[PDB]
């Protein structure tokens, strides 16, 4: 069908714009060094860069988390036109309802980033649509030390601010700016939650 | 090929940090591989000399002391025929257990060994932890060869080690006579009768 | 030998679309560095290098996990495996090997197509101040040292600024050693 | 079937050591009596194999038997060695020893990005002489899960 | 099975015999065999000391070498010690006697029954050692094997093997 490249380099790219976010905020320009052709580049790596956010001043962390949804915003509002050229039938730009574009996104975006549907969707009829997936793809492979499970959720909480930006981008492709929050919401058998506004 | 006649093994023993390996690596020609010390423990370099028109390979095995190789190094003194306790004159606590190394090496080495005693790092001549006359005396009532073993610009080792292979050579150079093979006759046309 | 085994790994690997993703992702995280610095361009190369380093150092263990390869030593073998079963496995493309040095050292890595600068047009203020695909020098410098070599990589030219090809002139400077497992007794 | 499982890094450190009959998975009391002399065994035999290897592709250790047990190795090209001490009456475990590298270590350590990919703790007392470990929660669970049918 | 190099090391480390026959080249031949032989004695010592919480050796007669040297199943003498290395190019067997005299056989035929065919050859080299080097008044103890009868008494048996 389409030309394809491998998922394991993309998922590992997708895991680490948060060290890129603290390396863009903290480095406005124990840290290490390397060289190139009569130069140097000062390096700091990911284990010693997400752990500067467990010791983050509160305006610094909230300054970082705008950038993660800004990345998600740019990739979402660039992704929506190519998914329109995929198929995207039977919906409009002003789009007086909301469930027909929540049927769009779980079948049509989240398959093209993660390969499956958002398998639950709950309908508050005044416009708060709950999108629940059970096993989220990039957080399949993260764990803390020997039963220190309390201090890792608050450690790993920047990593869900990419699908804030995705659903901001695919709705600013259809008109406007909205309000978004995230949850964790564990399963019932062998979680994540997003609103709409 | 190989073509040497005898092969002796000579341990270098002492405390750690007394300076045995730097004493070794000037002195043997080389061992062709730097390898490492502390993977199997003890490392080993060769040295070939000749005595009395016999050619000798001597294999120096210097032993590390990291407290892990407890049964291992005691298995490595099995069959050891030549020995050298090294001590440094700067530090002083090595001499408290030089006698400990001596009574561990009189144990389970051979029936009879020839133990030398060598004072490394004589270059820092202004830091003598123990007097040389006391160690000279302690060598005298223990039948041991004693050398200054000064560090740098020295040959103390190039005469003392040759003298150690001499004394260990006549401990095992027993006897031989000749391999001339010149007795030839009897080229006939064989009028045999059985 | 290799190119059969490269397609053999292209029959049991997880895939997704290279258009409409991943050019979007890399272009979005270079647009952020364009706007984050605030429209300066000789600094984004020295952040994309320092990000590609960290993404290459973890990629190399996945690449040795997929195909069972020994530690490469000469630049015949690294230049063969980079053109045949690293870029073919990870990015579906293959380069070609020209501009070979004296004494088997420094070669070039002309890329035919490029699924990082694919369908990108670069604005006029960065004709002489930006390298676009300079996460690739990050993955090569941070990936070839992890098989205990030591290298140096740099772009020479690019299709976006210049009609000549995208090529990386990788230089062997030295080969690192293995270290002996204590200082001393 | 399996007595012990060990990892060794490029910088000469044991980082994981599961010893069975429900013993320690940690280097509390069974450390230093066989860890950095098991590493010395495999390093000396790996050193004498490369001097004795004709051909172009030099080889590495596949198994070292004794009269009682066996040592099995898988020395990856990035300097990361899977050694494994087993029983008799079954052949080479090289398929299991690359299954661990292709489905547990790269799944849960190198693609974990909270933890370091272990090369050092970034000092010059990391050459052999420093200690650290991995202890990722999901790693230990599936690694004790998979080896458990091989009693 | 097959043998490409006989190495005979002492009871005190360094070797007393080796012949790398059918090399079809000139290999490296100096003190690197001495440091190899001492390295094998050291790792034979080390492989005693590590043993996990566990806390056999009955060969047969396969008629190797063509009357032969023995008839009956026997025992070995080393349990906590190195017995067989296995790699891609070669495979190294080793055999300790009771007195402490290890015999090392490097094998260029790779990939448990190789133990059974191996030690029935490495005891038949031990019988030639005890028959043709022990009754030798020019041969002192603890000295390289400079006898020239021992070479073409074992060459015939190994070319009778392979």
Swiss-Prot record, chain A:
The keyword Endoplasmic reticulum applies. It is found in: Golgi apparatus, cis-Golgi network; Endoplasmic reticulum; Preautophagosomal structure. The gene is TRS33. Coiled coil: none annotated. It comes from the Eukaryota. Part of the multisubunit TRAPP (transport protein particle) I complex composed of BET3, BET5, TRS20, TRS23, TRS31 and TRS33. Part of the multisubunit TRAPP (transport protein particle) II complex composed of BET3, BET5, TRS20, TRS23, TRS31, TRS33, TRS65, TRS85, TRS120 and TRS130. Part of the multisubunit TRAPP (transport protein particle) III complex composed of BET3, BET5, TRS20, TRS23, TRS31, TRS33 and TRS85. It holds the Pfam family TRAPP. CDD domains: TRAPPC6A_Trs33. GO terms for cellular component: cis-Golgi network; cytosol; endoplasmic reticulum; phagophore assembly site; trans-Golgi network; TRAPP complex; TRAPPI protein complex; TRAPPII protein complex. Belongs to the TRAPP small subunits family. BET3 subfamily. Disulfide bonds: none annotated. The lineage of its organism: Eukaryota, Fungi, Dikarya, Ascomycota, Saccharomycotina. Component of the TRAPP I, TRAPP II and TRAPP III complexes which act as guanine nucleotide exchange factors (GEF) for YPT1. TRAPP I plays a key role in the late stages of endoplasmic reticulum to Golgi traffic. TRAPP II plays a role in intra-Golgi transport. TRAPP III plays a role in autophagosome formation. Required for sporulation. Has a role late in meiosis following DNA replication. Signal peptide: none annotated.
From Swiss-Prot, chain B:
One of its GO terms (cellular component) is mitochondrial outer membrane. Keywords: Acetylation, Autophagy, Exocytosis, Golgi apparatus, GTP-binding, Lipoprotein, Membrane, Nucleotide-binding, Prenylation, Protein transport, Transport. GTP binds at residues 14-21, 62-66, 120-123. It is found in: Golgi apparatus membrane. The keyword Membrane applies. Residues 180-191 have a biased composition (Low complexity). Changing residue 120 to I: Blocks nucleotide binding. Pfam families: Ras. Alternates between an inactive form bound to GDP and an active form bound to GTP. Activated by the guanine nucleotide-exchange factor (GEF) TRAPP complex, and inactivated by GTPase-activating protein (GAP) GYP3. Gene3D superfamilies: P-loop containing nucleotide triphosphate hydrolases (3.40.50.300). It is a lipid-anchor. One of its GO terms (molecular function) is GTPase activity. It comes from the Eukaryota. One of its GO terms (biological process) is autophagy. Interacts with YIF1, YIP3, YIP4 and YIP5. Interacts with the GEF SEC2. Interacts with TRS130. This is GTP-binding protein YPT32/YPT11. The gene is YPT32.
From Swiss-Prot, chain C:
A lipid is attached at residue 72 (S-palmitoyl cysteine). Present with 2370 molecules/cell in log phase SD medium. Its main location: Golgi. The gene is BET3. Belongs to the TRAPP small subunits family. BET3 subfamily. Changing residue 72 to S: Loss of palmitoylation. The keyword Lipoprotein applies. Keywords: Autophagy, Endoplasmic reticulum, ER-Golgi transport, Golgi apparatus, Lipoprotein, Palmitate, Transport. One of its GO terms (cellular component) is TRAPPII protein complex. GO terms for biological process: cellular response to nitrogen starvation; cytoplasm to vacuole targeting by the Cvt pathway; endoplasmic reticulum to Golgi vesicle-mediated transport; intra-Golgi vesicle-mediated transport; macroautophagy; retrograde transport, endosome to Golgi. The keyword Lipoprotein applies. This is Trafficking protein particle complex subunit BET3. InterPro entries: Bet3 (IPR016721), NO_sig/Golgi_transp_ligand-bd (IPR024096), TRAPP_component (IPR007194). Pfam families: TRAPP. Part of the multisubunit TRAPP (transport protein particle) I complex composed of BET3, BET5, TRS20, TRS23, TRS31 and TRS33. Part of the multisubunit TRAPP (transport protein particle) II complex composed of BET3, BET5, TRS20, TRS23, TRS31, TRS33, TRS65, TRS85, TRS120 and TRS130. Part of the multisubunit TRAPP (transport protein particle) III complex composed of BET3, BET5, TRS20, TRS23, TRS31, TRS33 and TRS85. Gene3D superfamilies: Trafficking protein particle complex subunit 3. It is found in: Golgi apparatus, cis-Golgi network; Endoplasmic reticulum; Preautophagosomal structure.
UniProtKB/Swiss-Prot annotation, chain E:
The keyword Transport applies. CDD domains: TRAPPC4_synbindin. GO terms for biological process: chromosome organization; endoplasmic reticulum to Golgi vesicle-mediated transport; intra-Golgi vesicle-mediated transport; macroautophagy; retrograde transport, endosome to Golgi. Its main location: Golgi. It comes from the Eukaryota. It is found in: Golgi apparatus, cis-Golgi network; Endoplasmic reticulum; Preautophagosomal structure. SUPFAM superfamilies: SNARE-like. Keywords: Autophagy, Endoplasmic reticulum, ER-Golgi transport, Golgi apparatus, Transport. Coiled coil: none annotated. The keyword Endoplasmic reticulum applies. Component of the TRAPP I, TRAPP II and TRAPP III complexes which act as guanine nucleotide exchange factors (GEF) for YPT1. TRAPP I plays a key role in the late stages of endoplasmic reticulum to Golgi traffic. TRAPP II plays a role in intra-Golgi transport. TRAPP III plays a role in autophagosome formation. Part of the multisubunit TRAPP (transport protein particle) I complex composed of BET3, BET5, TRS20, TRS23, TRS31 and TRS33. Part of the multisubunit TRAPP (transport protein particle) II complex composed of BET3, BET5, TRS20, TRS23, TRS31, TRS33, TRS65, TRS85, TRS120 and TRS130. Part of the multisubunit TRAPP (transport protein particle) III complex composed of BET3, BET5, TRS20, TRS23, TRS31, TRS33 and TRS85. Belongs to the TRAPP small subunits family. TRAPPC4 subfamily. Present with 3130 molecules/cell in log phase SD medium. The gene is TRS23.
